[PDB]
Subunit: 78 residues, 2 copies
């Protein structure tokens, strides 16, 4: 149904938005500090001296737990 | 259908997960440091001496821009 398709798309897009913008594989779990952009996994974040979104200097990387990381989700990556 | 109900429930819960766990009004936009739990708006986070998830002392609150903002915008209606 249209209803199921649209809902499935919204869920798909949310899950994709939780993936690292560099490797597109690992979940985002790192915040660039001070700027606050939260777009990389730890391994990809480690290779950046400036934020890829805003180009602010990265003073340090803070580990984070995205609030949408839930066992409710099936978080398959093809 | 059962699947449509299932998707609605997942998405409803994910929407709540993107909103502050205290005030339930504002998108999460802060991380407790050092622990990394990312569950409150800055306003609520500022008033907490210990993490509401893990009870770690809060040394600092870091502003964060969650990568799931677009998804939250598109869940105003589920
Ligand atoms: Zn990565
Ligand atoms: Zn930035
Ligand atoms: Zn709040
Ligand atoms: Zn914590």
């Amino acid at each position: 149904s249209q209803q199921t398709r649209v809902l499935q798309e919204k869920l798909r897009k949310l899950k994709e938005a939780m993936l690292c913008m560099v490797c597109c594989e690992e979940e985002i779990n790192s915040t660039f500090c001070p700027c606050g952009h939260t777009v990389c996994c730890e391994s990809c974040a480690a290779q950046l001296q400036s934020c890829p979104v805003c180009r602010s200097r990265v003073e340090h990387v803070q580990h984070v737990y995205l609030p949408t990381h839930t066992s409710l989700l099936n978080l398959t990556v093809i």
